[PDB]
Symmetry: D2
């Protein structure tokens, strides 16, 4: 925590106490809860289609297009039958979900289609109006959103309700025109921390392809938590920082196992919670920074009571 980490947490925690922090949860947070992954269904939809399981060294063009082929060839009731076999499980809540909700966010957006962030909010007892379909934006019960942008399975374990095929990602901006637009209102008006992604994911690339179209300084740059095993390369860190991402690297704060992802999620997410107790005023001209931040608004007044200043200094 030399210069960038202590400047990033000085912005995240100064938005958490304003009610202006929004977390964007991915699948690598629910994968820590051992919720089944999407490699495990392309290989399943390869062996019921091509007869035998694939060898590997797997081309991306045979990855995205195969669960569509299992839809176009094997039909529809075959497609949403295996979703009732590999997703119809119960998994528990991992303590990154509680560390997210300890930050008191204004919204939570997710590309997850499990109700694990949705069971971690009635467990801690937080009321989010869950928007998983398009008919839920005009029926929001609160001002505080759990916006599942890739759908959910509350209406059933059918593929009509979740974005999984390759015909779904080309009709996303026409079958979900209000979830997509409500998401970009939140990115424009809040501070976005990404957690659970990998700097080349389809969602993060299709969301940095929108922010290029915006003006030069209209948005604030979203934060990014990178929990990859290898340290980040500075060519990659230069590229995404000139694109709309501040990248906090969890592999440059602790040093744990190459297969223990939980330590790198828990590193940054416990660092943020403890940093609300300031501990930044160690220089003598940083003590005067804090005190000017509380008092110099009151120069508009002409005299203050001394018992009112216990309310100024919290």
């Amino acid at each position: 925590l030399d210069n960038n980490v202590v400047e990033c947490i000085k912005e995240i925690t100064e938005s958490s106490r304003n009610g202006k922090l929004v977390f964007f949860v991915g699948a690598g947070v629910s994968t820590l809860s051992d919720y089944p992954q999407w490699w495990r269904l392309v290989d399943k939809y390869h062996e019921e289609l091509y007869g035998s399981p694939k060898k590997g060294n797997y081309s991306s063009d045979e990855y995205l297009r195969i669960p569509q082929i299992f839809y176009n060839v094997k039909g529809e009731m075959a497609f949403d039958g295996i979703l009732k076999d590999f997703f119809q499980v119960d998994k528990p809540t991992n303590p990154i979900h509680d560390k997210i909700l300890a930050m008191n966010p204004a919204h939570v957006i997710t590309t997850n289609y499990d109700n694990l962030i949705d069971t971690a909010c009635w467990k801690r007892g937080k009321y989010f109006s869950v928007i998983s379909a398009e008919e839920d934006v005009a029926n929001a019960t609160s001002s505080r959103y759990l916006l599942k942008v890739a759908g959910d399975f509350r209406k059933g374990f059918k593929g009509e309700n979740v974005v999984l095929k390759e015909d779904d990602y080309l009709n996303y901006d026409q079958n979900y025109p209000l979830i997509s637009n409500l998401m970009k209102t939140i990115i424009a008006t809040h501070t976005i921390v990404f957690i659970g992604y990998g700097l080349g994911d389809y969602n993060i690339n299709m969301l940095l392809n929108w922010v290029r179209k915006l003006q030069k300084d209209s948005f604030h740059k979203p934060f990014f938590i990178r929990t990859d095993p290898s340290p980040i390369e500075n060519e990659t860190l230069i590229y995404y920082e000139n694109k709309g991402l501040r990248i906090i690297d969890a592999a440059s704060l602790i040093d744990s196992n190459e297969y223990d992802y939980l330590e790198r999620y828990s590193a940054v997410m416990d660092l943020l919670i403890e940093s609300q107790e300031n501990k930044f005023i160690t220089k003598d001209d940083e003590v005067i920074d804090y005190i000017y931040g509380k008092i110099s608004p009151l120069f508009a007044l002409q005299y203050i009571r001394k018992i009112d200043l216990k309310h100024v200094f919290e």
Copy 2:
């Protein structure tokens, strides 16, 4: 019917879910210079004098763009600085709009008239006029000036007036469209001061066709035209997602008297909110019930809190 529209505007005003969409037809009840008086002035520096001809629209759209290209952008700015440094009052319509307690006010106007009425009461509205003000905003009540405003200059770049500004609106202003469209799907939208053919209304009705069947609520369109609406035009626009309360179909007035029609609907909304129509004595045994049926889940209520129940 009129009566069900009376209800849905009132009980959305009591929930923090009422947003107006204020047009140029109530900035001129407070008598602000209309845009057709500008284009007559632009017609006189380029050409001799406007031989009117009822203004076919091909001249009505291009004449600000032609004087922009020929004379220079400096002259396009000072004519706006001539016609719009006027300092006009507020009509009773603005007072009746804010007494209907909006969450937001969206407006196509480049005047400052609605913000000054919002400063004069106990509520603060975050003015967004430009593209930068979306992130650096304050307090989640928004006066959204979607056409630009002269709050940072009388130059012609800040406001959209030309025809290089209508077709580049999605490029130059991406975040003011997304925040305009988010308020529409969430809140209950009432239009004030439009005329059912507009670049701000028909560009909305083309976006609403791109949505699903029940994925939105239908906006209300308070229509104040002297000749009343016909049923088939009321069929065509109710099918496109506008519930039109016509002001000429509730009172009768002259073809030049606007404030009577604009207030006969706004008094019909506020005096529905400020309850003045209660008779038959079985309408009092469900106004009191609706304020006390929540309080059956409590064993005892303090008598100083029941005054806040009954407002």
Copy 3:
């Protein structure tokens, strides 16, 4: 004299294409469309337009007549006014003397179609989408709105406002092919005023073409008023070269054919 040379210069190479409009389908005495808009008015409202109707023509009245009055009944009036026959003007004879490689037209009669086989030039009519691939020659005729060749029904002619937005989706190939003909040949317009639906919808498409990369088209003005110094210099930037008939012959306020046949005689005399 530069603009009168290049049109004839493209005539010898056979790389010339004409864009044909509705200022010419009145000189053959074929019905202008607002006669229908007048009928569309008084069969929906119930009483005629004593006042000036505004925002109904291409805007609100044909669209409402399709669905409130009835769907097959919208074409019941179309067959009543467009199962007619009208004689070929000399403009359809004067244009064809310049040997067009193709003819694009927004008109929907068979009056540029009855002038072609009555001369001896073979054009295959691509007016619908099953006409695009299924063609008989590389010398094809392009009708971008349609024609009643399949029958007297409403869904073959672009008339409403539920067709001038999803024309770039329901007619996707013709809309592609029309742009292709502009990209190779040289396009001459006729029978439009500045400010129709299709002179602005094309120069919005021309802003999506880069610098020095297209042939700037030919748009001849046959409005009996003269050309301003202002409106001329404006449409030089949007891409248009203006040859003005009103700056060539002094004509009456209603002598239309004296202006349309003026520039057509200016071309054919300058052919050799």
Copy 4:
């Protein structure tokens, strides 16, 4: 049937309505640098050491785009001159295609290997490389280089290779996009030199499902893959509008006997007419 596909391809060959949508595998035969080679030099000169195994999605589909922004443009075209300034001979494939009398030749390749093969014979195709070339053409016969040519120079502005240029291509080449899909509906298209799963194949099938039910001459796919085509994948890509002709179904060849599988499918077209 394999005969029924040939009878339509030969009919458009005789009627003059045949256009070969030229792939890159017909130029991978002539020792021209395949694009996985440039990805390595962009990887090794940037990350220091090359990556083992297989590349990541941001490191295969975006690693020249990472290379262009981080390093620049003088060093991006410094590598393009090092592999693409060579002299090469034409295939036997580059003799069977032009002898089928094509109307237009639509390529994806940025080299003059399908181009100088035209100059050897009497077939005169006009190179449509830049945006100016559609209106500056002197012919009705077009060599439609939809990716570009190095004829102006060795700059990277002339070929679409990066990641933002498979996205800004509809804004920097709008007529060539319009001129290509013209030829797809009018002329009959034969795809030779690709694989099912290529990038520019699946963009055309997206434009296919936009069109009407029977609006287009549903083209043919010449599969020069070493493996045989699966029956499931055959029905899928055909229903999207690609009649699949496989060399592995006709002949049997080795895992690196490519040029025989490239030629044998063209042997059933030259000998058939």
